[PDB]
Ligand binder design. Structure first.
Ligand SMILES: [Mg+2]
Ligand code: NA
Ligand code: NA
Ligand code: NA
Length: 325
DNA sequence: GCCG
DNA sequence: CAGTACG
DNA sequence: CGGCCGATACTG
């Protein structure tokens, strides 16, 4: 990043607008930031800023005030509720709506939430692991976690393919959580395995809490939970597992590898080509309404590998490490 | 907020 | 359904 | 004007 001095200040607003619920304004700032940190050199002039995709007149203004005042006047008028909204929104399971409600109810600290707020089952787990859920783990630990899941899975079916995705696959030094994709080459042995996999991981005491896990449904697609490796000095870590049919392997891997912003940009590109891209598949000639929403099926394109998805979109392939946005 |  | 979440 | 990712996946 050659514009850290700028991106660090815009980050404050982006986050402020986000916790307040102004999602689209927040996105604007976030995409402007993803652009500056991705710039091949430091910005210097107002015009030079406007030439950058993702930065408009207003944003360019703010960029000059920073390079031209070392500061930004807007950061001094942010509501006093923001810090608290961010404190609350950082509880897993609580978003802008819940944070704003708690604030309106007079709550101002986690002690207030703990003693007076009504919490959903997920939020109670989020609060209990508040600090741990904000920490990142060394990638070496992510490996240990992936291996624990892989071994348990292959224990009852040696053919199961398990791959750590997310920031881990993108080669980052640390990871926020561990994303494990599980599928099977025969395109069938993946069905109804969550029940066995989870209880196995539970038997060894690996899983400590469950956030999202529809186990009554044999069609369960994901498990979002908490785990902890054995031994001293271990922290509770977020574990996200998805089981997918082999025919959707490439799209699921591309999805689960991210980054999130990379996925969104790629999906937006596919749409401009009359296609649709998701973790399930890439389709061409889909039917959309007057608002751009898909309301009719197109034709699912053959995508045995990630490269195929890039190729079909007229895009040069990009290693996972280069999808870090 | 940005962009068409 | 609205809310929150995953990348 | 109006989309900004996903006809995305759970929860209650
Ligand atoms: Mg991750
Ligand atoms: Na621009
Ligand atoms: Na949250
Ligand atoms: Na459940």
């Amino acid at each position: 990043n050659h514009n850290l001095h700028i991106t660090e200040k815009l980050e404050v607003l982006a986050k402020a607008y986000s916790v307040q619920g102004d999602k689209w304004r927040a996105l604007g700032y976030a995409k402007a930031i993803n652009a500056l940190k991705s710039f091949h050199k430091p910005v210097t002039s107002y015009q030079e800023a406007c030439s950058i995709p993702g930065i408009g007149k207003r944003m360019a203004e703010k960029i000059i005030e920073i390079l031209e005042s070392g500061h930004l006047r807007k950061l001094d008028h942010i509501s006093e509720s923001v810090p608290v909204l961010e404190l609350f929104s950082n509880i897993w399971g609580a978003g802008t709506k819940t944070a704003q409600m708690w604030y309106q109810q007079g709550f101002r600290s986690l002690e207030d939430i703990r003693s007076q707020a009504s919490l959903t089952t997920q939020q109670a787990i989020g609060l209990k692991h508040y600090s741990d859920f904000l920490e990142r783990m060394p990638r070496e630990e992510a490996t240990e976690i992936e291996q624990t899941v892989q071994k348990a899975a292959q224990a009852f079916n040696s053919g199961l393919l398990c791959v750590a995705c997310g920031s881990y696959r993108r080669g980052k030094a640390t990871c926020g959580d561990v994303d494990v994709l599980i599928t099977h080459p025969d395109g069938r042995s993946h069905r109804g395995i969550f029940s066995r996999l989870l209880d196995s991981l539970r038997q060894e005491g690996f899983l400590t809490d469950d956030l999202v896990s529809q186990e009554e449904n044999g069609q369960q697609q994901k498990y979002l939970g908490v785990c902890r490796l054995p031994g001293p000095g271990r922290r509770h870590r977020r574990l996200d597992i998805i089981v997918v049919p082999y025919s959707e392997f490439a799209c699921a891997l591309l999805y689960f590898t991210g980054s999130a912003h990379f996925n969104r940009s790629m999906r937006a590109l596919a749409k401009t080509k009359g296609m649709s891209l998701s973790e399930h598949a890439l389709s061409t000639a889909v039917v959309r309404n007057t608002h751009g929403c898909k309301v009719g099926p197109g034709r699912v394109l053959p995508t045995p590998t990630e490269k195929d998805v890039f190729r079909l979109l007229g895009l040069p392939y990009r290693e996972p490490a280069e999808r870090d946005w």
